[PDB]
RNA sequence: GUGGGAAUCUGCCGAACAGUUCGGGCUAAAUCCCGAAGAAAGCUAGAAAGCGCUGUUUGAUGAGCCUGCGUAGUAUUAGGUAGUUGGUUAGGUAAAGGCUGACCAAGCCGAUGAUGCUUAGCUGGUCUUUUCGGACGAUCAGCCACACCGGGACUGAGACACGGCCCGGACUCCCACGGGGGGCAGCAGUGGGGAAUCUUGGACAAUGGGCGCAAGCCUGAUCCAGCAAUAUUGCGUGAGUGAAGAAGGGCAAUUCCGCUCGUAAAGCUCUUUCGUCGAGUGCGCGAUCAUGACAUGACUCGAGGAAGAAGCCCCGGCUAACUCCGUGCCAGCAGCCGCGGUAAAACGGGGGGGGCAAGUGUUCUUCGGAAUGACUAGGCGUAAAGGGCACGUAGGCGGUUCAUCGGGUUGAAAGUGAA
């Protein structure tokens, strides 16, 4: 299918950690429980910040835990910079 | 509780203690009698009931009741012990089986005698 | 090797056989690739025996090279999917027979 | 939508038990209008009118004393086209009288029409 | 368990395409080993165009590896990790990869419960239950782990190999005393523990497997017998008739053959299912071209005489079923309420009766009844139970219209859901 997640960690070289979301159907009580799985992914150029929504593609094992390749960054996270904030404040 | 509460914490079961722990989930045990004595019941009933302190094969010290009329139990005597308490005597939780090991059957018993180990009398 | 063989069903003194395609190292009553049909070794009320087979599946396994065992060769020949076994060209062992007719309902001689 | 839908349905039942003639519902929704249309077709309310549906809606409903209870589900409930009758035999309190209203790709239907159209969806509620 | 993936191997079996040349070595030879070309290996006119091997394309079957989802209890366990998390480069593997050597960065897991502790093989399923759940994982079948306890590799397509090898340890048996040998958690069987669980059987006739061109040889896999009321909606223990209402037993204002056991028994007529005994055919059948342990069986016929076959619990209420005698708060019974102190339907015996029936009672364990952990399907003023009161993190829940999209949802089709 299509796996879309939010990046939660980018402090490795050529690697990101992406959190994916799913809904588990609790059959006895007939409600849906949100569950989370964290996935480690490959990103050669080191471009993903913390907070962006990326899409994952399956691949062969690249490390002990890295099994996914980042394919496209859907929505880019917003970053506040104080100096550029004051620069746009002056205008 | 709300359904969210039941999802986060489930439902437990009721607390109930085991009655016959010394049997250890077995129907009968084999024991050796340490003492054979009498005890008075709880009032208003007044009698002298025959009990025997039995050390079981798993090294447990229990009190057993002796059924029927008359007995021939001695000390260091091998008896078979089954579950089932006696209401008059507090702390006595077991019975001795008549008719096996050394505890003999009762001759002359005619009604309900297989509970006391008596053999079937000969029809003449 | 993939083989077409028989697996035992039924109960004690009452046999029944299932024609199954199995791997050769599998147990007699164990793992199988497919089930292909049934065979009743006992004679029925019509004076004959009963057999059912999956013709397309047996065709597929024979085309990919399965080796039928020695009774399955006989049953596939009588079903007309294989050539006859070599030892059937020999003729029966003749001799006298107890041809006294028996009443079918009572089992006594007529 | 579920909170305001159950809000209006409980308003309707509470005013039915007092023997009133009309009720006013605000806020409203298109799902609520379609639910009321199903009730009017099955004969549990006489008429309903929608006022100012694109700025601030209000709905006036005329009652006659025929509806016993209306519920709207406050949770998500999926149903397929072949589970409708078995679900209906366990949802309605009497298991005979009453209609389960589900939402489908073909629209907001009741449970008897959706069997004929062979389409499932989300259960909205029921009235009996 | 269920569904997938790419970075690999695959003896035997099916189908193509090409070869099978020459020296040496093991006391003697080779389809055993070494070398050269390109890889090899030859046998048979006894199997001469019939087997076998090697290389290259492929089908089929297995195997290695990776992975999404789902899968105990415990917070009176809150921090864990240092090859640990990633990167580069080398080595290794049939194969991706921290699998590991060197170097570089400080990451990785965790309040959506890491780690610590306790317990446990998992599934298809078994028992119970108006659906849900609960207990179990015993037989049979699929996967995994283990083979006296620890550690290794060799051969091999495939093992780190239950009845193969090497090393260490404990136990054990021989020794000629130098040292060797052994692993029933394979089928029987023996001590020990226990409340308790089986024959030191027959045969490869059927099915399956190994070797062999076949002929055939092995197979405690299996098939079939033995023991055990351990289980299962089975069958039988006779069908009629019989009043001298026999004898005898029990009870009685001691009523109506005084009431009952009682047409019950004895006796008379009939028929022999199951079992007993004696014989006969057997390509009846499991098996066909032939091959029958079971089989002293089964089938058919004959002999017989109701002949060989009914117990267990209960009778105060719950709960179907009552009287006499002995005992005297003693002996005793008991699942709960309770009975027994001189007229006991409750203790023990006589008689009579009720319920099941080759069974029937006691104990242990599970579910239901139990709405007695309440999703289906409960509660918190006075009965068990609203935090002393708020603010807020995660989480949960939450207005209206118009348009776009297709992850959830939904309809159809295909694959899969072993037996
Ligand atoms: K834990
Ligand atoms: K499976
Ligand atoms: K070992
Ligand atoms: K055989
Ligand atoms: K029994
Ligand atoms: K008899
Ligand atoms: Mg790995
Ligand atoms: Mg264990
Ligand atoms: Mg119930
Ligand atoms: Mg389990
Ligand atoms: Mg066992
Ligand atoms: Mg080998
Ligand atoms: Mg090798
Ligand atoms: Mg071996
Ligand atoms: Mg062994
Ligand atoms: Mg054994
Ligand atoms: Mg013993
Ligand atoms: Mg064979
Ligand atoms: Mg062969
Ligand atoms: Mg029976
Ligand atoms: Mg007979
Ligand atoms: Mg005979
Ligand atoms: Mg025959
Ligand atoms: Mg026999
Ligand atoms: Mg009564
Ligand atoms: Mg008296
Ligand atoms: Mg009683
Ligand atoms: Mg009595
Ligand atoms: Mg319950
Ligand atoms: Mg509730
Ligand atoms: Mg309550
Ligand atoms: Mg409240
Ligand atoms: Mg308060
Ligand atoms: Mg308080
Ligand atoms: Mg819209
Ligand atoms: Mg969609
Ligand atoms: Mg389908
Ligand atoms: Mg099945």
XYZ file of N, CA, C and O (backbone and C1' of nucleotides) and ligand atoms in Angstrom, chain E residues 129-132 368-371 377, ligand 9:
64
model
P -23.751 -26.676 28.628
O -23.801 -25.140 28.225
C -24.086 -24.149 29.193
C -23.776 -22.768 28.680
C -24.639 -22.248 27.549
O -25.906 -21.795 27.974
C -22.374 -21.754 27.112
P -27.207 -22.114 27.094
O -27.074 -21.149 25.839
C -27.905 -20.002 25.713
C -27.432 -19.090 24.612
C -27.588 -17.597 24.896
O -26.475 -16.876 24.385
C -28.714 -18.157 22.895
P -25.014 -17.007 25.035
O -24.186 -17.679 23.869
C -23.265 -16.890 23.146
C -23.243 -17.199 21.677
C -22.318 -16.281 20.889
O -21.676 -16.995 19.839
C -24.514 -16.077 20.066
P -20.081 -16.906 19.686
O -19.650 -15.765 20.709
C -19.258 -14.484 20.244
C -19.259 -13.465 21.353
C -18.060 -13.482 22.273
O -16.919 -12.866 21.715
C -20.033 -13.285 23.551
P -19.197 -19.725 33.266
O -20.680 -20.290 33.209
C -21.402 -20.338 31.991
C -22.638 -21.183 32.134
C -23.657 -20.693 33.141
O -24.508 -19.716 32.586
C -23.302 -23.019 33.413
P -24.850 -18.387 33.403
O -25.809 -18.890 34.563
C -27.140 -19.289 34.286
C -27.707 -20.116 35.408
C -27.861 -19.422 36.748
O -29.049 -18.659 36.830
C -26.892 -21.562 37.044
P -28.998 -17.065 37.011
O -27.575 -16.786 37.651
C -27.210 -15.469 38.036
C -25.752 -15.179 37.791
C -25.115 -15.874 36.593
O -24.174 -14.984 35.996
C -23.908 -16.394 38.541
P -24.426 -14.385 34.530
O -24.732 -12.854 34.782
C -23.950 -12.096 35.687
C -24.730 -10.947 36.273
C -25.876 -11.338 37.199
O -25.968 -10.395 38.262
C -26.710 -10.043 35.415
P -28.451 -6.458 26.202
O -27.543 -5.974 27.414
C -28.059 -5.098 28.409
C -27.398 -5.312 29.746
C -25.978 -4.775 29.877
O -25.755 -4.357 31.222
C -25.975 -7.088 30.277
Mg -25.780 -17.014 30.438
